[PDB]
Amino acid sequence: TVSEANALLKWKSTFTNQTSSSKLSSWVNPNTSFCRSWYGVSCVRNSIIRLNLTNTDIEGTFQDFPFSALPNLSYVDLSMNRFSGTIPPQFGDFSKLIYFDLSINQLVGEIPSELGKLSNLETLHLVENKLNGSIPSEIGRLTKLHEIALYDNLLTGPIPSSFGNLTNLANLYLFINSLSGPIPPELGNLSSLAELCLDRNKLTGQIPSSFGKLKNVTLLNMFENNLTGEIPPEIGDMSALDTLSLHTNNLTGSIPSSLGNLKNLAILHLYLNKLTGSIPEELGDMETMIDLEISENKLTGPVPGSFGKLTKLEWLFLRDNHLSGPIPPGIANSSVLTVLQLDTNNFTGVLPETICRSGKLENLTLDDNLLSGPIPISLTNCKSLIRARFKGNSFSGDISESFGEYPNLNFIDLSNNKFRGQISPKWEKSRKLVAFIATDNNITGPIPPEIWNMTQLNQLDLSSNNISGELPETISKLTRVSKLQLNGNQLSGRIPSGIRSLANLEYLDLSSNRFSFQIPATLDSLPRLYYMNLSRNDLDQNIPMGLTKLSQLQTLDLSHNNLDGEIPSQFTSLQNLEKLYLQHNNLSGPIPSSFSEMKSLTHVDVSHNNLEGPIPDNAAFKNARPDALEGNRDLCGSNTTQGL
C-alpha cells in the first residue's frame, strides 16, 4: 500500500507534458493519504483495488506501469488520455481484474494474448486506439465476459471461433476494424448475446445459419462488410431482433420469407446488395416495421399487396431495383408513412389512390418508371409534400388541376412526362420552394407573373414545353435564381432587360425560342454567370457591349440568330471564356486585332456569316474543322480552309 503508493508515484513521474493543474497533484504523502485522498485511487483493506484516471490529461506509456506492485487491482479505467506504446502482457497478471478500459488513447501494437488469463474479467474496453494484428483467441476463455468493445482500431484477422465459448457475453462491438475471413458459426452459441455489431469491417463469407439460435439479439449490425451468399432463412428465428442492418455487402439470392416472423423488427437495412427475386408476401407481417430499406438491389416482380399491413411504416426505400407491375395501394396506406422512394424501377400502371391519404407524406420519388395516368386526388391535396419527383414517366393531365397548394414544398420535378395545361399561380404558395423542374411536357400558355414573386427559387426549368407569351420585366424579382432554363418554348418579344438583376444567375438558357429584336444593352450585371445560351432565336442587330462585362462567362452561344455588325474587340474582358459559338448569323467586318489576348478559348464557331479578313492566332481557330469556319465572305489572308 505504501509500496503501492510509491510504485504509482514512480510511474506518475514518467508522465510528460504535465501541468500543475493535473488532478494527480493530489498524489502526495504516500505513507498516510493513499486510500483517502489520491484522485482515482480507492482501496479495500488499505490496498488499491480501483484505479480510475479517465480523462486526466495523462501523457505516457505503460512500459513502467507497476504491474507487480498492484496485485489487487480489480477496476482499471485509464481511458480518454494520451497513453501511447503497446499493451504489455503483464496486464494479464491482474487476477482480480473485473473492469479493464484503455479506450480513447494512442495505443499501438497487438492485444497481448495474456488477457485470456483475466478469468474474472466482465468488461473489456479498448476502443479508439490503433491496435493492429489479430484478436487473441484466448479472450474466448473469459467466460464471465459481459461486453467486449474493441471497435475503432486497426484489428485484422478473423473473429476467433473461441468467442462462441463466451456464454455470458451480451454485447460484442468490433466495428470499424479490418476483421476478415468468415464469421465463425460458433457465434450462434452466444445465447446471452443482445447486440452484435461487426459492421464496417472486411468480413467475407456467408452469414452463418447458426445465427437463428441467437434468440436474445435485438441489434444485428453487419453493414459495410464484404459478405457473400444468401441471407439464411434462419435469420427469421432471431425473434428479439429490433434492428437488422446488412447494407453495403455483396449478398445474393432472395430475401427469405422468414423475415416476416420478426415481430419486433422496426429497422431493416438491406440496401446496396445484389439481392434478387421477388419481395416475399410475408414481409408484410413485420407489424413493428418502421424503416424498411431494400433499395439498390436486383429485386424483381411486384411489390406485395400485403405491405398495407405495415401500419407503423414510416420510411420505405425501394429505389434502384427491377420491381415491376402496378404499385399496390397498400404500399402507401400507412398513416405515418412520410418517405416513399420508388424511383429507378419498372413500375407500370397508375399511382394508387392511397398515396397521401393521411396527409403526412413528405418525400415521394417515382423517377424513371413506366407509370402513367393522372395524379391521385389525395396527392393533389397532400399539403405535407416536401419533395416530389416524377421525372421520366408518362403522367398525364391538366397541370393546373393536378397539383394543389403545397405550402411545405421544397423540390418538385415534373420532367419528361405528358402534363398538359397552364402553369397555375398556386405554385407561389410554395414559399419554401427552391427548385421547380418541369422539362419535356406539353405545357402551354404563359408563365403566370406570380412565378417571378418566388424570390426563394434557386432553380427554375420550364424548358422543352410549348409555353408562349412575352417575358415581363418583373422577372428581375427572382433574386436567388442561379439555374434558369426557359429554352425550347414559344416565348416571344424582346428578352427583358430585368434579367440584369438576376445577380445570382449562373446558368442561363433562353435558346430555341421566338425572342426578337436586339439583345438588351444593359445586360452586364451577372458576375456569377458562366453559361449563356441564346441560340436559335430571332435576335438581331449588334452584339451588345454589355455582354463583354460578364467576366465569369465560360460558354457563350449566340448562334442561329440575325445579329449583324462586327464582333467587338472588347471580348478581351472575357478572359475566362472557353467556348464561343457565333455561327449562322449576319456578322460582318474584319476580325478584331485582339483575341491573341485570350488564352482560355478552346472552342469557337463563326461559320455562315459575312465576316472577312484573316483568322487570329489561337488554338480553336487552328483546330477548327471546315464546318466551324466556312460560309464567310473573305476567309483568311491566304484563302485557307485549314491551317495557315
Binding site: 481511458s79 478500459d101 480513447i104 468493445a149 454485447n171 462491438y173 466495428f175 447486440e195 455489431c197 464496417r200
Partner: peptide, 5 residues
C-alpha cells in the same frame, strides 16, 4: 466507450 453502432 461501449456504445452501439
Amino acid at each position: 466507450e461501449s456504445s452501439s453502432s
